[PDB]
Amino acid sequence: AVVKCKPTSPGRRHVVKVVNPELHKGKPFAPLLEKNSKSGGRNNNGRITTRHIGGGHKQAYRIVDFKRNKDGIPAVVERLEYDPNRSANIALVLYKDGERRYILAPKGLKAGDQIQSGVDAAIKPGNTLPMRNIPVGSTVHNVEMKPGKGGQLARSAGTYVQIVARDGAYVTLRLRSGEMRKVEADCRATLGEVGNAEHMLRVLGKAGAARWRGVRPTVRGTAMNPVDHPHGGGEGRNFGKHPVTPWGVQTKGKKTRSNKRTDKFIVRRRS
RNA sequence: AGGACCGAACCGACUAAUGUUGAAAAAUUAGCGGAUGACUUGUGGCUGGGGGUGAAAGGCCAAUCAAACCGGGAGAUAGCU
RNA sequence: GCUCGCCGGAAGACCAAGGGUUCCUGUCCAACGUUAAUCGGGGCAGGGUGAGUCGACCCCUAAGGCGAGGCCGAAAGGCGUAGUCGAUGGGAAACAGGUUAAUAUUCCUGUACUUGGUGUUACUGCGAAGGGGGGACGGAGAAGGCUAUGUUGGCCGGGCGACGGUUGUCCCGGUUUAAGCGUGUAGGCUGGUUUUCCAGGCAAAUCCGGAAAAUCAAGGCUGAGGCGUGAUGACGAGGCACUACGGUGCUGAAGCAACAAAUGCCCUGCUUCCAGGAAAAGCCUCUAAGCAUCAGGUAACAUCAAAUCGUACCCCAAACCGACACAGGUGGUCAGGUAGAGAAUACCAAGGCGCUUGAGAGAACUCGGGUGAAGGAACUAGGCAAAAUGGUGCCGUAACUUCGGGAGAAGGCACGCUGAUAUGUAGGUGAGGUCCCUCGCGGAUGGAGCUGAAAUCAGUCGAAGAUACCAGCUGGCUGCAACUGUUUAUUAAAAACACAGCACUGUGCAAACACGAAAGUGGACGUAUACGGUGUGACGCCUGCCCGGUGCCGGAAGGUUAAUU
RNA sequence: AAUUCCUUGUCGGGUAAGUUCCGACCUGCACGAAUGGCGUAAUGAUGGCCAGGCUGUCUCCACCCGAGACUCAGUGAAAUU
RNA sequence: CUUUAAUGUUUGAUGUUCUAACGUUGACCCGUAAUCCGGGUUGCGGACAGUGUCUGGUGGGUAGUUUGACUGGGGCGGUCU
């Protein structure tokens, strides 16, 4: 639940917590863990390509199954767990055959709840089927964009998409961004929304709370000298030029999509 | 519980005096700040010059930085001393 | 050699890194040493570093590096798979004592341990570049149970005091002993056992996992310390003989208990929180391909092997980095006594030093300090500096406020010593004995002895009892910024930079964007409650008018318009 | 006003006397609403001002303790010219 | 040879469809005890995309450079035949 701390110190007034006792107060499933070394926003060349990334708390990667291709085998939820590599929580499930796997935790999932994947699955949250069988107007998550590769849409805390139509081998969807996309009617999708909706209500309250996430401070650009940024300098706070990224692009309205290749799957775009 | 309080180690460097061919090519003495954290530290590693890195001062990149150092073009050019 | 003085959470002791003979002895004093020098980290010569158990090498891997093929690229070359390197991490085993002018957990003595090879004997399902388990992991906090260690008592030995007194409730010293083996406690986790079945673990599996039953509740794992053994020993203050007073043989007393007690061990635990906490091998198992009077496996005994390199010395410093025998810098371990909350501070122990020019004089002035009549900021750009405050407990404490704070607000009182309450209380610790007992490192009882606050009353000395070192000045109005933090190494620590929060905008994933001739990588093993960029800068009340200009986003009838033809 | 040239604006408070400071006035040379506006408890080695206490900061210096200076012996520089 | 409809062929435009180039940072199989790469099967896209040459626009993102003289000092102003 959302919990507002008390102002026992400057740094605890505006901090807001998102607690959940349903989560496992123990270690995760080790067989489904992997090393995850932080990068610092640097690539094989050692150069910073994405700024404002550095440090943070150590993290281990949980192998989550975004495909959900084990059809015809029921699975019961064992426990809900916390995942630092994503904004949503994950649910450890146990299949009847004795195989355990991690999945995204939908809105109304608990311990003991049953789920299943395939074409002959029931229409309940947590189950996964190709969208050809999902009734129109429904709500799903962890949607595939190409059959078999795995879910790529609606994977965040409280995100979802709504199936709005189905013409042929394609179905039209409205993503959480408002974009009206269409994908093949063979991509698997999971019923229901991802359950951590109260995640957005969280309030860090202090700077150090962002440094635990691996987020480094952001220096604006106005106060940064001409040689280091177009906005640069000026005696005082002048900024008498158009807002612009480094490397010289607007950043305040200019559209930068230049795909051309995948424009046939975008019905409406947004706004 | 706490980027919580006082305060040593530890990390810093606000004031003053001294020193200024210094003990020291930035220190000493007396006080000062932080001191479970955006902390500090050892070892090793990556990022290379119009580039790197930068909680951004044009700061740092081997006592050298508004474009490092070494060599080379090179006996640059110098209507000036 | 006798005194004096200094450090003693080091100015002591042991190491790494680094250095590389500076170590020890003898000899020499030109140069080196900021003076002399018989001395020296100086010169010359000689000697000195002994390991199956410490470390490296080695096995395993992290970041990351190289990278067969391969992809990419004018050439050079770049990225990278399989792989192979790479510790700052994981992985078998030795303790005490004695000894050299200089080394030792390395030599000697004593007592142990570990991993392998071979052979014999006995009993046998063995087998992986595969599966599983385990290794394997965070922060904070809370105690409890222990020890290191210390104090006191007792015991042993010695002593009877350079000056009054000191045969006693006196003084000094010592009272030490390990690994390992055995016991398996305080205490923590766990419910076990048997049989059947199974879409899983790339194939298989008696293993893991899962399902369903039956039968039992005691089964097991981990585990400091303690005790016993180790040890009829060793060491041992001191003695008997030699004694070049340089030291060597023999002998060598007591060698217990209680209390206190860690930041260390139980603890890779328990509790709790969000920021959700390495990998791989060794090791334990599983079977497959395959091999079965073999081979291999297991236990026992015997025997052999455990190589190679390092080991001296300095290591907060005269030996490393700083041009110096330079008030500098340099990571880890050991952590005594009194007072104290304390690793602060003061005085000491062990131990180590007095800082490589001295003597004398006692002017100005300079530096670092002490005191000060009366006044008390009149000094000055400015209370710069200095002075002052300073502790514990009780009492008590304003505006304002985001109700947490402000606040240690301010302010006021009491602190010593002796005695009594109480021949040392409350409290803590806990013996003998008794009772019980699954007869054990047990439980209960028992309260001996030891230790030991705080408070009250009374009395007493001093100018002064938080007496030393140590140790907040306080309050009021106001600007800026919310705050903690960050910054111009070497004249600027700030109202600047960050910041949480807010907003605009971009981005549908082969994402935008960025580094790259490209491959590709990061973004992200993320998927719009997400990522990037811009600006603002907690919170609270708000954020008005203008789209002409520039830019961005959209739309079209027309005009204008490139290559091309 | 961190913004006000004229300017020590005007009035008042505080002082024996206040170009600074506090509070109102508005005549804003040339504030103004996210290059944010106005408030804001707490915080700050932050800027400015007033008090109590305190003192050699000063009136106005005086004495004393030490290290130099001075003399002797030894070693033995430097900028400059 | 002034004139104009159904054709054949000719090429051009718009639209629809297909697959065979090309693409696949979709799935599966082998090389292979390999998330590289390649080959193969299939699916999805599909002559679009993307690349090359040419070309228009944008383009301080990044370079190389210019930004006069006289002058009762220079600058502002004025002046230059």
Q: Which nucleotides of strand B are protein-proximal, with an atom < 7 A from a CB?
A: 1-4, 37-39, 46-48, 52-58, 66-67
Question: Integer distance in angstroms from CA A254 to C1' C553?
Answer: 7
Question: Integer distance in angstroms from CA A239 to C1' E2?
Answer: 77
Question: Integer distance in angstroms from CA A132 to C1' C49?
Answer: 83
Nucleotide nearest to A10 (CA to C1'): C483
Query: What is d(CA A256, CA A23) in angstroms, rounded to the nearest whole number?
Result: 41
Q: Where in chain A is the domain with CATH 4.10.950.10?
A: 195-271
CA angle A61, A50, A144 (to 5 degrees): 50
Query: What is d(CA A2, CA A207) in angstroms, rounded to the nearest whole number?
Result: 20
Resolution of the structure, angstroms: 2.5
Query: What is d(CA A143, CA A191) in angstroms, rounded to the nearest whole number?
Result: 10
- Amino acid making up residue A111: A
Q: β-strands A33-34, A180-184: how paired?
A: unpaired
Query: What is d(CA A68, CA A129) in angstroms, rounded to the nearest whole number?
Result: 9
Q: Which nucleotides of strand C are protein-proximal, with an atom < 7 A from a CB?
A: 62-65, 79-80, 132-134, 136-137, 198-201, 208-211, 272-279, 402-404, 482-484, 496-501, 504-516, 520-539, 550-554
Please, are residues A109 and A126 in contact by the beta-carbon 8 Å criterion?
yes
Please, are residues A243 and A232 in contact by the beta-carbon 8 Å criterion?
no
Q: A86-114 burial by CB neighbour count: b if 16+ within 10 A, else e?
A: bbbbbbbbeeeeeeebbbbbbbebeeebe
The strand pairing partners of A180, in sequence order, are: A174, A268
Is strand D less than 7 A from the beta carbon of A238?
Answer: yes
Query: What is d(CA A56, CA A215) in angstroms, rounded to the nearest whole number?
Result: 7
Question: Integer distance in angstroms from CA A248 to C1' C520?
Answer: 25
The top-level CATH class assigned to A1-113 is mainly beta
Q: How was this structure determined?
A: cryo-EM
Q: Which nucleotides of strand E are protein-proximal, with an atom < 7 A from a CB?
A: 25-28, 43-46, 48-50, 59-61
Question: Which letter does DSSP use for residue A247 in this model?
Answer: T
Q: Sign of the CA dihedral A64, A157, A142, A90?
A: positive
Query: What is d(CA A196, CA A106) in angstroms, rounded to the nearest whole number?
Result: 8
What homologous superfamily does CATH list for A195-271? Answer: Ribosomal protein L2, domain 3 (4.10.950.10)
Query: In angstroms, how far is CA A161 from the centroid of its own chain?
Result: 13
Count Cβ atoms within 10 A of the Cβ of residue A132 and give its class: 0-12 exposed, 13-18 middle, 19 or more buried: middle
Please, are residues A103 and A91 in contact by the beta-carbon 8 Å criterion?
yes
Query: What is d(CA A182, CA A172) in angstroms, rounded to the nearest whole number?
Result: 4
Nucleotide nearest to A63 (CA to C1'): C525
The residue assigned the tokens 């507002």 is A4
Question: Integer distance in angstroms from CA A29 to C1' C376?
Answer: 78
The strand pairing partners of A56, in sequence order, are: none
Other C-beta atoms lying within 10 Å of the C-beta of residue A12: 13
Q: List all residues 6 or more positions away from A227 whose beta carbon is below 8 Å from its beta carbon.
A: none
